[PDB]
């Protein structure tokens, strides 16, 4: 797309690695280790796709 195609998404991180041929369809807010963070985004919390 001439100004950018944003219809294709990719994943930057998970909780851990993944076994072969597996599908991680589930999407949720990801926190970093020990900080209590849920519901919305912010510090050490943003949408992984």
């Amino acid at each position: 797309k001439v100004s950018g195609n944003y219809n294709y998404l990719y994943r930057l991180f998970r909780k851990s690695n993944l076994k072969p041929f597996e599908r991680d369809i589930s999407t949720e807010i990801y926190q970093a280790g020990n900080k209590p963070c849920n519901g919305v985004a912010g510090f050490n919390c943003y949408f992984p796709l």
Partner: antibody, heavy 118, light 110 residues
Framework: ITLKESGPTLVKPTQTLTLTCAFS??????????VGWIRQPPGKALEWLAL???????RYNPSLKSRLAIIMDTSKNRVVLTMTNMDPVDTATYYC???????????WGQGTLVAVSS | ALTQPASVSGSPGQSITVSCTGT?????????VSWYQHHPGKAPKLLIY???KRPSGVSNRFSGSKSGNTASLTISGLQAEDEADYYC???????????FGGGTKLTVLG
């Protein structure tokens, strides 16, 4: 393939332009093709206005977002461009065309010219 | 950006060549640049897509080639109705994503 362009002849300085263009015959089962609108006045070269894909995405020229709207029929009949708050420098001719990405404008319509009544 | 000479002239029959160029920083790797022709009172038509690929319906006398930062087209065997408004259109990533020539008006001396 036929492309039909319709628009007013003379418009008021405070009126909004409603250009229409109809296309007959395309391979709609594709990706990246679409319908584009371009204009030029006499005495100055060409400049692009807008382009629409088949997924409903609208791409206008920058800093002209608010005064450009597109009616897409979802029936493969016609595409309408409605532009508000016109300027007497925009009194120009308008071409509706098909838009791939290699062919920047593959087939060109006849287009219609418009001028201000002021 | 993208620029070309405003007008060009020469002897009828042969000996004409029209070129475009632009700044390499604005130009996104210089792919998919096309050459069109505009007539007064008639709809413009496509002649050359992506430098040196020939579409259907055109004659073999039209040719195009690009060297370094400059692209160009040549035509041999000119006629009395071969005056044109040859435009180059290209992709520019930093500014407005499409750029459309600088204006040409070929004239003959017949």
């Amino acid at each position: 393939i036929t492309l039909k362009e319709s628009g007013p002849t003379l418009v008021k300085p405070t009126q909004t332009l409603t250009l229409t263009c109809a296309f007959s015959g395309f391979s709609l089962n594709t990706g990246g093709a679409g319908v584009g609108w371009i204009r030029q006045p006499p005495g100055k070269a060409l400049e692009w206005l807008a382009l629409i894909y088949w997924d409903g995405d609208k791409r206008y020229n920058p800093s002209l977002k608010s005064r450009l709207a597109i009616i897409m029929d979802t029936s493969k009949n016609r595409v309408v461009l409605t532009m508000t708050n016109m300027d007497p420098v925009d009194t120009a001719t308008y071409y509706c065309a098909h838009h791939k990405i290699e062919y920047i404008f593959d087939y060109w319509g006849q287009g219609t010219l418009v001028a201000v009544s002021s | 950006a993208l620029t070309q000479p405003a007008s060009v002239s020469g002897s009828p029959g042969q000996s004409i060549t029209v070129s475009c160029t632009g700044t390499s920083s604005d130009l996104g790797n210089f792919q998919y640049v096309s050459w069109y022709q505009h007539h007064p009172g008639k709809a413009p038509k496509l002649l050359i897509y992506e430098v040196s690929k020939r579409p259907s319906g055109v004659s073999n006398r039209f040719s195009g080639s690009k060297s370094g930062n400059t692209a160009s087209l040549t035509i041999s065997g000119l006629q009395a109705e071969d005056e044109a408004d040859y435009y180059c259109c290209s992709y520019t990533t930093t500014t407005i994503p499409v750029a459309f020539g600088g204006g040409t008006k070929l004239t003959v001396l017949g």
